[PDB]
Amino acid sequence: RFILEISGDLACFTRSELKVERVSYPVITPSAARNILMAILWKPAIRWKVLKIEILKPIQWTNIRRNEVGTKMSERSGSLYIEDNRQQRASMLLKDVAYRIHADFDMTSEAGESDNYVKFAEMFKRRAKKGQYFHQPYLGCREFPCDFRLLEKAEDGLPLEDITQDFGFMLYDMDFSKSDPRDSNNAEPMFYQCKAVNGVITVPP
RNA sequence: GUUGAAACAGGGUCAGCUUGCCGUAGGUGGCAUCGCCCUCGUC
């Protein structure tokens, strides 16, 4: 297990229901935490899996109505012109957030030759301690980074000490087992928060 | 290296065109520097 602390100023764990108005999730998405761990280090052999999220900063909603685009790019239209495809997508961002995601990893079917668990574990530990990453972690959206810092146990205070509020079904991690190399078609299996006592745990598939 | 990616607050708008702080009004009634004092004792 790795107790990697994710911290940042603003966040945007955009809910699947409110994508037109990017209302952020109450806490960090387990799928977002797995994506962060993969952007720090990943390979066609290592399969990241989130185990437990421990909140370290109170939930603070901040509405930032951003102006987005609503039409994708392709080989057809050589240009976009946002003056004809403007989208005033709201974004209830999460100001001042901090989470120490306890998570580990397994092995995929295409592990290859170098399928050593200890090798990938040490590589992830070095990348988290020195500050190396394949891609900058994002707090639900790439417009917000993550001041990550690998913790050995606990090096920060948490506000949710007693029994708090349950956030219901949140997006655990989309099912990409039915997807070919480079995902395309997927599903959406979700899970309950159980109870945000101090550090909510995830239910592995 | 197969897992949210792309995202405008805008192009831009004289806060004025203006309006007498005045019309206007006694520091006044009026009150003794006084009631008083050897330039001396005198060489």
- A72 Cβ contact list (under 8 Å, min separation 6): none
- Resolution of this deposited model, Å: 3.3
Packed helices A117-130 and A30-40: angle between N→C axes, nearest 10 degrees:
90
Instruction: Give which of A9, A10, A25, A32 is closest to A101, Cα–Cα.
Output: A32
CA of A42 to C1' of B28 (A): 102
Residue A14 burial (10 A CB sphere; 0-12, 13-18, 19+): buried
CA of A134 to C1' of B11 (A): 39
State how far the Cα of A95 lies from the Cα of A154, in Å rounded to an integer. Answer: 22
Protein CB footprint (7 Å) on chain B nucleotides: 1-10
| Minimum-distance nucleotide, CA of A66 to C1' | B7
Method for structure elucidation:
cryo-EM
Coil, helix or strand at residue A91: strand
| Minimum-distance nucleotide, CA of A45 to C1' | B1
For the CA atoms of A51, A202, A18, A21, what is the dihedral angle to 10 degrees? -30
Coil, helix or strand at residue A33: helix
Q: Which residue places its CA closest to the C1' of nucleotide B4?
A: A141
| Minimum-distance nucleotide, CA of A127 to C1' | B1
CA of A71 to C1' of B10 (A): 19
State how far the Cα of A18 lies from the Cα of A98, in Å rounded to an integer. Answer: 22
